[PDB]
Amino acid sequence: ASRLYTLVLVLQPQRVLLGMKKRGFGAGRWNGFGGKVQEGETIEDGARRELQEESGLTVDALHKVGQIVFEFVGEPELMDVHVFCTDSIQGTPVESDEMRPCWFQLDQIPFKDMWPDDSYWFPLLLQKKKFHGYFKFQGQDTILDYTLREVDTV
């Protein structure tokens, strides 16, 4: 089976917001905000909730931009990540226990300190293209298989 997750990228014309994960799963890597969808909330609800929790930020509209399925070898549940983006945010991002936020110019995205799959699908994000992705990981650094396609409906 699969578990739903969310990922929220605040993409502004000349910069993208990322957070350095301070503890837990994926510590020491920059990434968007997000996490597990809870029982009782929509996916979009959970994306807004984790955005608020990890950065203090609220948004008016999130747009569906991607879906990436992850398999980790030896882990039974696939991770079904729904990727959202927004330009217009509400508030100034602040550090949480989980995330230290920072803006990045679009030409200085810290790919070598991000999840490896980001190098593959982030360009599609920056092109405002919608995508389906699949990545199979051995551990947390090695991509063994992957597929990536642009779609019409996420």
115 DSSP β-pair partners: none
The rounded distance, in Å, linking the Cα atoms of 26 and 114 is 9
The rounded distance, in Å, linking the Cα atoms of 83 and 100 is 20
Q: Which is nearer to ligand C9L, 7 or 93 (CB)?
A: 7
Q: Which stretch binds ligand C9L (CB under 6 A): 39-47, 58-66, 94-102, 110-118?
A: 110-118
118 marked as part of a ligand binding site: yes
CB 90 within 8 A of CB 60: yes
Site track for ligand C9L across 111-140, x = CB under 6 A = ----x-xx------------------x---
> Least distance from C-beta 60 to ligand C9L, angstroms?
22
Do the strands 2-12 and 30-31 form a parallel or antiparallel pair, or are they unpaired? unpaired
Give per-residue burial for 100-135: e unless 16+ CB within 10 Å, then b: bbeeeeeeebeeeebbbbbebbbebbeeeebbbbbb
116 marked as part of a ligand binding site: yes
| Two tokens, residue 95 | 């550090």
- Tell which positions 1-60 bind ligand C9L, by CB under 6 A: 5, 7, 26, 31, 34-35
Binding residue numbers? 6, 21, 25, 31, 33-36, 50, 53-54, 98, 115-118
Binding residue numbers for N(6)-methyl-AMP? 6, 21, 115-118
Please report, as ranges, the residues that interact with ligand C9L according to CB under 6 A.
5, 7, 26, 31, 34-35, 70, 79, 81, 115, 117-118, 137
